[PDB]
Design a protein around this ligand. Structure first.
Ligand SMILES: NC(=O)C1=CN([C@@H]2O[C@H](COP(=O)(O)OP(=O)(O)OC[C@H]3O[C@@H](n4cnc5c(N)ncnc54)[C@H](OP(=O)(O)O)[C@@H]3O)[C@@H](O)[C@H]2O)C=CC1
Ligand SMILES: NC(=O)C1=CN([C@@H]2O[C@H](COP(=O)(O)OP(=O)(O)OC[C@H]3O[C@@H](n4cnc5c(N)ncnc54)[C@H](OP(=O)(O)O)[C@@H]3O)[C@@H](O)[C@H]2O)C=CC1
Ligand SMILES: N[C@H](Cc1c[nH]c[nH+]1)C(=O)O
Ligand SMILES: N[C@H](Cc1c[nH]c[nH+]1)C(=O)O
Lengths: 428, 428
């Protein structure tokens, strides 16, 4: 009956309101004031009001809203004490190891379920193999992604969050198929009117995230890396065609290549393949019927390479605008494409950070490359993504020796994570 | 030493200034007041000033500008009398037959050279076979297209015209290779600093026009035909992606198909094939080096079908903007794509006209289909273009029985033209 929610951002707050309203757990939340002025403001805001709040924008999302209190807000991970049956990881996947390893032995021994909200491919392996030293029968559950889009409207009230959208479909896998915990989650999803497909394993669920296949090619190319680390003369945009953004036949090829390296790896683990195009058009964002042939979408996996590339290119071109938005009087639709790149920035202690795009893709990609090695699968496209990213970080260090830089600029990170994946795969 | 310039629009006026300044010919120009309030205003404006004028916009085009008089402006074709060595056809190709056949026998017997400025594929055949009844050794010359872009800024002064652009490259073919007339034209081009490639025959030159291959698929599809004949709820645009315009994988396929039907026909006549992509990117409008692979461009003709289609699709997407224009401060480039469709319109006598796009493509396409039959080459894509266009004209007649309609709405036009092409091909 105790739950530990690791994270104090909007994801954590939204999940905590679901637990508060729909579970029997006492909820403790854990931030990190030590390492973060964002966590600190959140702690200060909660201390003052003694309430969090979730608002919604589309009334379709009733179930998710509410004001609530938790049992305890911990300032930092090291402060956690006692026993918790269930740990929810609502942080970034590149912190799961580093975070859990700050928990006490006593805490770590009490845990029966770890729930990964936004895992990468291999996260369940890391977390299972880590937590194995302390429980013998730890249940690990992975979602495909967080359930929607939540944010803070007002930075000075970060305990008030707004859920703007919910996903059409999530996937969930457990290390313990059809467990009590799976069934409760299923029953909860059905109340929140969120479609949830249960799959065979956590790894299966981790591969039904389109950002896996799409973000590395979009962000880890020289156009994007320049725009992130050096900037440009006029704004450029993530989803636009060259020269307005990175998209190009070269990029789409790299995406196909990466997707195929990935599909080799999944064949090794015996996980079904991902029809990328179908996934994008039937699950992410729709296009008009005239844009793509229903057969091409359905049979995408057996079509010739060049055709797969063409269809991917077309999908991206079809969403330069929102083709379902109301066009204005001159026939112009909403500019859906115009998402700027986040640049490296200085936090409030003058430390230079690399934004989540592409920091977290360096992580996802480094994990996939390390799993590729361990299985003897080749990964030459992944390799090149990593090399490019490492080259930009090295260029940044060389170019800005005055400046104080985060440890995201360092090599090589993730040794701990990689060692746990090595171990897990030796056993099986 | 007499030249007859058929046409009184901007093309005719620009060509006449070239003749006035750089030839020894006395120039007579022929309009058609009978059939046209545009011709009439032109005649009235010239009568009043007794000058035409060509201005230029880019000073790169010095050679072409000037004020001038001609020897005689004829109000109508039937009025022409006397002998002319050279006839320049500066009208639309769908009028060449109908126009020449209004000339007198005496006039028709004196003619040694006919020069086709904006011919379609087969125009030289029509004009050669027609004029054969009157001269035995008629020289016919075809250009690929008119030399640039000229227009009337001010409709009330249509004798004042502005040449805005000149083409990078023209092609010219003669029925009499390396004739005196070819060499004079070559020498004239070199003075106007216009690159002119002389080719083996007129038909060769008529096939180096990109509008041949591109306009029928762009305009003779159901999206475009609706927009032209019925209109739409918000403006749509010729060069935009669905739903903003017609461009789509379906369209590009039709373009490939048509281009291939055409390349079969040229193989019959032993004319070299047209590398469509190369032509578009090296001659029409450039793209950035990152957009297309130099090898794909060069080897376009031997690449697989799907790849040819992908590359065509990409070319069109790359020019949604002018990728060489100055982007503004938000990174937005000139909207090069936003060319509206011209709709059916009523002339000043309340007769409904079909605009040149697609009237003239119905002509070009009908000629190609008739040449296909005569050679036993199949043309199923062309056939469908014609069927669609005929269907829209029939729908318009059914839907607007109150309205007075032009003869562009009639079936079947061009019997005269087709009979001359039949004859020409029986002989060779
Ligand atoms: N719409 C959304 O909100 C979506 C979010 N996601 C993903 O879900 C995850 C959670 O995102 P969200 O709540 O929105 O944003 P946050 O960045 O606020 O969430 C991540 C949480 O984990 C914390 N964290 C990071 N490193 C550590 C560490 N070493 N120890 C303890 N805690 C740590 C963060 O702290 P701090 O507050 O100090 O930054 C934060 O509280 C992210 O991976 C995000 O990208 C995915 C899709 C949509
Ligand atoms: N930038 C440009 O100007 C370009 C033009 N072209 C093409 O070159 C050709 C000439 O165009 P342009 O001068 O610009 O425009 P116009 O429409 O003014 O030119 C066509 C000329 O031929 C005349 N004509 C049409 N039918 C007949 C007939 N039965 N008897 C006698 N004359 C006739 C027209 O008369 P009227 O004045 O009554 O309409 C006009 O004088 C067209 O095919 C055009 O599409 C091609 C590329 C670029
Ligand atoms: N909805 C994601 C991201 C996005 C594209 N354009 C704007 N945002 C997708 O590609 O389907
Ligand atoms: N310049 C022609 C026509 C054009 C395209 N976009 C605007 N105009 C071309 O396609 O190359």
């Amino acid at each position: 009956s105790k739950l530990l929610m690791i994270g104090t951002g909007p994801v954590a707050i939204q999940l905590a309101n679901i637990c508060y309203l729909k579970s029997d757990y006492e909820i403790d939340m854990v931030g990190r004031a030590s390492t973060s002025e964002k966590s600190k403001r959140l702690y200060q805001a909660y201390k003052k009001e003694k309430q969090f709040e979730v608002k919604i924008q589309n009334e379709a999302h009733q179930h998710l809203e509410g004001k609530f209190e938790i049992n305890r807000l911990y300032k930092d991970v090291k402060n956690v004490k006692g026993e918790y049956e269930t740990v929810v990881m609502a942080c970034t996947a590149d912190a799961y190891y580093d975070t859990l390893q700050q928990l006490s032995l006593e805490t770590l021994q009490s845990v029966k379920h770890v729930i990964l909200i936004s895992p990468t491919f291999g996260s369940q392996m890391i977390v299972e193999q880590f937590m194995s030293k302390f429980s013998q029968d730890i249940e690990v559950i992975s979602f495909s992604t967080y359930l929607g889009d939540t944010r803070i409207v007002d930075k000075e009230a970060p305990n008030h969050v707004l859920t703007t959208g919910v996903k059409k479909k999530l996937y969930m896998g457990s290390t313990h198929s059809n467990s009590t915990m799976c069934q409760r989650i299923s029953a909860l999803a059905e109340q929140l009117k969120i479609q949830l497909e249960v799959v065979e394993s956590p790894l299966h669920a981790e591969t039904r995230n389109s950002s896996l296949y799409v973000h590395p090619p979009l962000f880890m190319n020289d156009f994007s890396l320049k725009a992130i680390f050096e900037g440009t003369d006029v704004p450029v945009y993530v989803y636009k065609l060259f020269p307005e953004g990175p998209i190009t036949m070269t990029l789409i090829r790299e995406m196909r290549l990466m997707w195929k390296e990935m599909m080799a790896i999944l064949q090794a683990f015996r996980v079904p393949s991902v029809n990328l195009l179908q996934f994008m058009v039937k699950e992410n964002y729709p296009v008009r019927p005239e844009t793509l042939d229903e057969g091409d979408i359905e049979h995408f996996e057996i079509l010739p390479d060049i055709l797969q590339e063409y269809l991917l290119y077309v999908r991206y071109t079809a969403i330069l605008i929102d083709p379902f938005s109301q066009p204005d009087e001159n026939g112009h639709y909403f500019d859906f494409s115009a998402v700027p790149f986040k640049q490296v920035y200085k936090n409030e202690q003058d430390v230079v950070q690399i934004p989540r795009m592409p920091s977290e893709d360096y992580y996802r990609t480094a994990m996939i490359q390390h799993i590729g090695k361990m299985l003897g699968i080749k990964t030459p496209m992944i390799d090149q993504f990593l090399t490019r990213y490492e080259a930009s970080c090295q260029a940044y260090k060389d170019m800005h020796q005055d400046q104080q830089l985060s440890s995201q600029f360092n090599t090589n990170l993730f040794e701990g994570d990689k060692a746990l994946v090595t171990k897990f795969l030796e056993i099986n």
